[PDB]
Amino acid sequence: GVQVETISPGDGRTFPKRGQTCVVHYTGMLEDGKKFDSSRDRNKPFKFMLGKQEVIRGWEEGVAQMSVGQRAKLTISPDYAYGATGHPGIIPPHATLVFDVELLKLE
């Protein structure tokens, strides 16, 4: 599945409803700690709509339980991320992923 561990707390009240676009700052890395993607390094947040299957299952279930302002470590199982196929040339097969994600605001 997905494990959410809070790094920095949010308001504990404003959770993302379906329909809203979540605007977040993320850093994706493999189980060893090597980064593969980071919106922070680009200085440009990532916007996406929740509950439309836009993102991997770990995000769909993990980001849904975060509050606005919260920063969390999302440890995601390979069947909740890319799985056996992976994402060729970035994420290999059967890869546990770790996302440091911050829910900045909703639009």
Ligand SMILES: CO[C@H]1C[C@@H]2CC[C@@H](C)[C@@](O)(O2)C(=O)C(=O)N2CCCC[C@H]2C(=O)O[C@H]([C@H](C)C[C@@H]2CC[C@@H](O)[C@H](OC)C2)C[C@@H](O)[C@H](C)/C=C(\C)[C@@H](O)[C@@H](OC)C(=O)[C@H](C)C[C@H](C)/C=C/C=C/C=C/1C
């Ligand atoms: C320029 O950067 C890449 C992202 C890279 C690509 C490589 C990745 C390793 C990683 O580096 O992001 C990564 O960090 C990651 O793992 N992310 C990203 C952050 C959200 C969580 C997760 C992550 O789930 O991303 C997702 C899966 C890759 C594919 C999807 C997993 C669920 C599955 O149902 C989808 O089947 C169609 C495939 C990519 C998403 O971001 C983008 C926004 C969504 C899609 C490509 C599809 O939905 C697509 O459908 C037809 C759409 O509707 C979009 C809105 C259409 C539009 C024309 C194309 C947008 C493409 C944007 C590409 C971006 C932003």
